[PDB]
Amino acid sequence: GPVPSRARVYTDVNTHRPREYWDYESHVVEWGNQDDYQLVRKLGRGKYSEVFEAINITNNEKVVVKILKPVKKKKIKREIKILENLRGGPNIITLADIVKDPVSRTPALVFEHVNNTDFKQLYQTLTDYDIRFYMYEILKALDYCHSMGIMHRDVKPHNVMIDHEHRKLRLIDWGLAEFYHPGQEYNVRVASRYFKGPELLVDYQMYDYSLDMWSLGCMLASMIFRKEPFFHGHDNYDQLVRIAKVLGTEDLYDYIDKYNIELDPRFNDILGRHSRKRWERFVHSENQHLVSPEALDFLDKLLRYDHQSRLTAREAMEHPYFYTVVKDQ
Numbered sequence: 208g209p210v211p212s213r214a215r216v217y218t219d220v221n222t223h224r225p226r227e228y229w230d231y232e233s234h235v236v237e238w239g240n241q242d243d244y245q246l247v248r249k250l251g252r253g254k255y256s257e258v259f260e261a262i263n264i265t266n267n268e269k270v271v272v273k274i275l276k277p278v279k280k281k282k283i284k285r286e287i288k289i290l291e292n293l294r295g296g297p298n299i300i301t302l303a304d305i306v307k308d309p310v311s312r313t314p315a316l317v318f319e320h321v322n323n324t325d326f327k328q329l330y331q332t333l334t335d336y337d338i339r340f341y342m343y344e345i346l347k348a349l350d351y352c353h354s355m356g357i358m359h360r361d362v363k364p365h366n367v368m369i370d371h372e373h374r375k376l377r378l379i380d381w382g383l384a385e386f387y388h389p390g391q392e393y394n395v396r397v398a399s400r401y402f403k404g405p406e407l408l409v410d411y412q413m414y415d416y417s418l419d420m421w422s423l424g425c426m427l428a429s430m431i432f433r434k435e436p437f438f439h440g441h442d443n444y445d446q447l448v449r450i451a452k453v454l455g456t457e458d459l460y461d462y463i464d465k466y467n468i469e470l471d472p473r474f475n476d477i478l479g480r481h482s483r484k485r486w487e488r489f490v491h492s493e494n495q496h497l498v499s500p501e502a503l504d505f506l507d508k509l510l511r512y513d514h515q516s517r518l519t520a521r522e523a524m525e526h527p528y529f530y531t532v533v534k535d536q
């Protein structure tokens with residue numbers, strides 16, 4: 208069978224906490240009063256939930272309500288527990304309240320209100336510095352949640368809110384996040400195709416925080432190269448093919464050998480033989496202002512098949528790409 212793996216960092220953080228910290232099935236949800244919030248307008252619809260702007264009539268504060276679609280109670284408890292554990296952490300969305308409709312029995316998460324700058328506006332105007340700054344802010348949230356024993360497992364642009372006017376950022380949608388325990392086999396059917404790590408695609412279940420670092424690398428690539436999505440797979444199999452056409456097949460097969468991974472016979476037809484490509488082939492006159500030796504070195508050190516060889520969040524934060532942003536703090 209496959210060779211086991213443990214996180215290189217924050218390995219045992221949960222083992223040292225009281226069981227209640229991570230044993231979310233035991234968590235009893237503290238309900239607030241639904242009548243405290245009036246819905247104002249729909250903001251979005253999102254697979255597991257519908258999102259509204261609302262107002263707390265107790266105090267006239269603007270709030271955001273996520274009305275959950277039917278999910279298992281255990282997965283709701285998981286998300287709530289994680290949100291509560293991470294509350295106060297840098298750039299983590301703040302859960303303000305939890306309410307249920309007395310009639311429809313539907314449950315609703317109440318968050319802090321954060322405005323999002325118009326995507327068209329923001330993207331038009333970004334700048335190399337801005338990307339470094341916001342990437343650093345995301346890394347602060349990931350180092351924090353990893354240090355708290357939690358993997359996000361769905362890092363991607365949709366789950367990053369920015370308010371450019373106030374230089375503010377939040378990592379949202381903790382609904383797929385899970386506690387890391389050494390030895391645990393996790394579900395590989397998580398995260399969106401374009402952001403799935405090789406570990407998920409080859410069905411290596413004993414993964415860890417480092418999954419998030421792959422996803423982050425995918426985000427960085429899409430931003431500096433102005434290509435979304437960067438790895439555009441047609442399905443889960445082709446997703447790995449797209450990766451292999453860039454990172455090359457030699458290192459992929461080395462990874463599968465090292466962990467004694469058994470590959471679906473299908474991959475053995477489609478994967479073929481691919482050299483490792485240089486990042487320069489994605490650079491053009493439109494994106495060159497975003498692309499630097501530092502950016503490429505950083506990218507290279509996130510996008511690695513072997514989850515153990517990817518940068519940690521804290522290592523990433525020390526990378527030369529961020530020197531000027533850190534100097535500003």
Ligand SMILES: Cc1nc2ccc(S(=O)(=O)N3CCC(CCNCc4ccc(-c5ccccc5)c(Cl)c4)CC3)cc2s1
Pocket residue numbers: 250251252258271300318319321323329330337338339341342363364365366367368369379380426430
């Ligand atoms: C508690 C909660 N409150 C709200 C409030 C509104 C909503 S929403 O459903 O209406 N909607 C979700 C989708 C957002 C778009 C995500 N931004 C993309 C982005 C992300 C990152 C970047 C980026 C990345 C790296 C460097 C620089 C910028 C860049 Cl360039 C762009 C808008 C808002 C849900 C929640 S959940």
